[PDB]
């Protein structure tokens, strides 16, 4: 498949290996769920760029569940922040809050409403990125500076356009 080829060419080997183990754990093959493969890789990469945009951020995403819940619990015991019911993506030590990162092929406000209805904790901050340079965040507080968010949005647009040059974007956007 071309989608798997694109994933292995454009994403860093570490991100690809993380996405593959995350899928293989639940019985999913990246050679069939190729759009899900690309989506996991893209989300992981966004989380890592977000965390490097500051150290200000703790990466929860990408860790095995044991190590991730260990990190979340250590944060909760040293800070007193309430424990999330779902594993979030990052922790902001400056704002002292968990962040849930979303990357959507659809409208930012659709996905934002979906995520907010999912987590149901006003504590966890929501930040949604689109592939069109659009973004939506809790209380319109975008946490990061304009340069870091422009970095993320450029990378997302580039993934979309490299998918389009391979005639893969149409499959990808109708797959969420
Ligand atoms: Mn996550
Ligand atoms: Mn997420």
Numbering used by the authors: -1 to 52, 74 to 195
Sentences from the paper on this structure:
Baloxavir marboxil (BXM) and its active metabolite baloxavir acid (BXA) is a first-in-class inhibitor targeting the influenza virus polymerase PA N-terminal endonuclease domain (PAN) that was approved in Japan and the United States in 2018.6 The RNA-dependent RNA polymerase of the influenza virus cannot synthesize its own 5′-mRNA cap, which is necessary for eukaryotic translation. To overcome this, the polymerase engages in a unique “cap snatching” mechanism, in which the polymerase subunit PB2 captures host pre-mRNA and PAN cleaves 10–13 nucleotides to serve as a primer for viral mRNA synthesis by the PB1 subunit. PAN is a metalloenzyme that is essential for viral replication, is highly conserved, and is not naturally occurring in humans, making it an attractive antiviral target. Despite its clinical success, BXM has demonstrated susceptibility to resistance mutations, specifically the I38T, E23K, and A36 V mutants of PAN.
In addition to the co-crystal structures, the apo structures of WT, I38T, and E23K PAN endonuclease were determined. In all apo structures, the active site metal cations Mn2+ are coordinated by His41, Glu80, Asp108, Glu 119, and Ile120 and a total of five water molecules, producing an octahedral coordination geometry at each metal center. When the apo structure of E23K is compared with that of WT, the terminus of α2, where the E23K mutation is located, is distorted. In WT PAN, Glu23 forms hydrogen bonds with Arg84, stabilizing the terminus of α2 which promotes the correct position of Tyr24 for base stacking. In the E23K structure, the change in charge that accompanies the change from a glutamate to a lysine results in a loss of hydrogen bonding with Arg84 and no stabilization. Lys23, Tyr24, and Arg84 become more flexible, causing disorder of α2. Unlike the BXA binding to I38T, no rotamer changes were found when comparing the BXA bound and unbound in the E23K structure. E23K disrupts the end terminus of α2 and allows Y24 to extend further into the active site, disrupting important hydrogen-bonding, pi–cation, and base stacking interactions made by inhibitors or natural substrates such as RNA. The E23K and A36 V structures are the first reported structural data for these mutants and may aid in studies to develop a structure–activity relationship (SAR) for these variants.
